């Protein structure tokens, strides 16, 4: 099928000690401007880095001068790491991400409840782009409205809560208006006083 | 670095003592999958992604070998300088709107984790029911954050974090 390729960690030549490595691909306008940065980290302090804008290893602390000089000599290492912008970033974007991450769309669940203040809870959607607006009798009310930040759920779903300060007199109609890319037409949920 | 999306590919984390390793992929802050180093298996966050793409878990095992190696060398290079601990912070919230009676998930979000070794547990009595923990996530400052999940049937909880950079285990109430 279509396959994820990870970078290749360059190798080097009580009390606890921690090592960590990562490859950060940075896509802007799809694959138009890719940037590729690999980082090696010992005890939370980053010590060696590759940056595709630099074109070669550099050392972020002194403890990393060995590995940056070394990895810059052996061109089997440096040309390969330079090429991981294609064999990892461009490849994973134009490949598996397109069949998975970039195609996930999950429609929000919008429900209103009265804790007076009405709360519009918008849950379990992807991607992150969402607009949530309150109307009163068909009139956008941006006064007394307060939302959460984008709350990331950690299961590939987000969640936002929009509370409105109001006072109900029988007959009034408050509506929560939710715009999202998963949505054909915007969702509206009404609450009659 | 400004960007539209961010693939964070092949995160290899190793620490000794304990031989504790972890290999994950990430996209736009969300975990694609980890490689299980014992059962040697790609474990996807979303099963439905395991059906539309794949990753050979042996790239993970060889990258974890490389990274263990580098941990030995750099341990020695700096003359066995040890890692400094951190105080992690939790935050407890529900997955869906809390409707007494209907089934829901309860999310404990811990951050400023370093090193990546934490115990995260949950009425003033311990629970091991619908507990799902996530992998360690990467922070821009090279600390970690982890999310624990507890499925519960709401009715009229404390997240208990036990770490090293915590003088006493901390509780966040519900």
């Amino acid at each position: 099928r279509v396959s994820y390729y990870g970078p290749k960690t360059s190798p080097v030549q009580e009390r606890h000690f921690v090592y960590q490595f990562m490859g950060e691909c940075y896509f802007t306008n799809g694959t138009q401007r890719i940037r590729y940065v690999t980082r090696y980290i010992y005890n939370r302090e980053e010590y060696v880095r590759y940056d595709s804008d630099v074109g070669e290893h550099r050392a972020v602390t002194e403890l990393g001068r060995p590995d940056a000089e070394y990895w810059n000599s052996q061109p089997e290492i440096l040309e390969r790491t330079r090429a991981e912008l294609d064999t990892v970033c461009r490849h994973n974007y134009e490949g598996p991400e397109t069949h998975t991450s970039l195609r996930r769309l999950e429609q929000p669940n919008v429900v209103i409840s009265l804790s007076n203040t009405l709360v519009c809870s918008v849950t379990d959607f992807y991607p992150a782009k969402i607009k949530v607006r309150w109307f009163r009798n068909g009139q956008e009310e941006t006064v007394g409205v307060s939302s959460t930040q984008l709350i990331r759920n950690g299961d590939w779903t987000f969640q936002v809560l929009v509370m409105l300060e109001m006072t109900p007199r029988r007959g009034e109609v408050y509506t929560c208006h939710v715009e999202h890319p998963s949505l054909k037409s915007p969702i509206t949920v009404e609450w009659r006083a | 670095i400004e960007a539209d999306h961010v693939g964070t590919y092949g995160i290899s984390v190793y620490q000794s003592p304990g031989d504790i390793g972890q290999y994950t992929f990430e996209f736009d802050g969300d975990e694609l999958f980890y490689v299980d180093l014992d059962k040697k298996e790609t474990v996807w966050m979303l099963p439905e992604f395991g059906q539309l793409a794949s990753f050979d878990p042996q790239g993970g095992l060889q990258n974890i070998a490389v990274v263990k190696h580098n941990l030995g060398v750099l341990t020695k290079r700096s003359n066995s300088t040890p890692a400094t601990n951190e105080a992690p912070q939790a935050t407890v919230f529900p997955k869906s709107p809390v409707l007494l009676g209907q089934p829901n998930t309860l999310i404990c979000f811990v951050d400023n984790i370093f090193p990546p070794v934490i115990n995260i547990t949950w009425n003033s009595k311990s629970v091991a029911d619908g507990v799902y923990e996530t992998s360690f996530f990467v922070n821009r400052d090279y600390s970690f954050h982890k999310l624990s999940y507890l499925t519960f049937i709401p009715s009229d909880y404390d997240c208990k974090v036990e770490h090293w950079g915590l003088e006493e285990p901390v509780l966040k109430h519900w």
Partner: T-cell receptor
Framework: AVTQSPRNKVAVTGGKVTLSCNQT?????MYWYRQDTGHGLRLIHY???????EKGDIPDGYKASRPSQENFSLILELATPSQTSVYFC???????????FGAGTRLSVLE | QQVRQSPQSLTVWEGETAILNCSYENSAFDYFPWYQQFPGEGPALLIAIRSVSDKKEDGRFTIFFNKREKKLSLHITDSQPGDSATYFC?????????????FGHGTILRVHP
């Protein structure tokens, strides 16, 4: 260099044979192949570093053991006549373009 | 995914160019090393090509790579009799970081003086 031991071995069905491989290239990866006609070279077990071993394509009947960066040992606990063959060990660096083989081990398992 | 080599054995007289043929069925393979095994010994790296090239030249030995047909050929010119050995075509997709390598079944080249 990569050397194996023993170079030749006779054994009966149902005994414990232990091929063993030593490598002094400061390599990390070590492999255990077998060579039979009609089948080319076939991977049995391999390893990425000391403590770890991985199941190759034909792991049935063999165990492996990598106690050291330099040793890597194929182990047959109940040898069969189907396990007679020529075994080669290999090593290589991380992400290396080259495998480095040993001279070979002829093994006969006889009823 | 398999690697298939032809012919299963080749006999050549001192001077001819031997031609060992290989093909693979997995389009993701991108590194193709050929291993030479002398009798009684263990195989050693002879010559390797990468998928971004269509020909690697080294002495009397040359790899010809063809990506569209998924086909390789090793050409030995001025075939000495000491070239007699079994020649293995091998392939990996390097991207998967696995470490394993897929081996052809070998062709036995027996050169006559």
């Amino acid at each position: 260099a990569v050397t194996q031991s023993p170079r030749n071995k006779v054994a009966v069905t149902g005994g414990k044979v232990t091929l063993s491989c030593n490598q002094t290239n400061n390599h990390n990866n070590m492999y255990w192949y077998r060579q039979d006609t009609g089948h080319g070279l076939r991977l049995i077990h391999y390893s990425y570093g000391a403590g770890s071993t991985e199941k190759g394509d034909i792991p049935d009947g063999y165990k492996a053991s990598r106690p050291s960066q330099e040793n890597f040992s194929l182990i047959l606990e109940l040898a069969t006549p189907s396990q007679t063959s020529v075994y080669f060990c290999a090593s290589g660096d991380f992400w290396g373009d080259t495998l480095y083989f040993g001279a070979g081990t002829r093994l006969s398992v006889l009823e | 995914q398999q690697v298939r080599q032809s012919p299963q054995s080749l006999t050549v007289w001192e001077g001819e160019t031997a031609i060992l043929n290989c093909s693979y069925e997995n389009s993701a393979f991108d590194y193709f090393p050929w291993y030479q095994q002398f009798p009684g010994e263990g195989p050693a790296l002879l010559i390797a090509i990468r998928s971004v090239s269509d020909k690697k030249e080294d002495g009397r030995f040359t790899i010809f790579f063809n990506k569209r047909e998924k086909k390789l050929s090793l050409h030995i010119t001025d075939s000495q009799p000491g070239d007699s050995a079994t020649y293995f075509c091998a392939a990996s997709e390097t991207g998967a970081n696995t470490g394993k390598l897929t081996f052809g079944h070998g062709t036995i080249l027996r050169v006559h003086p």
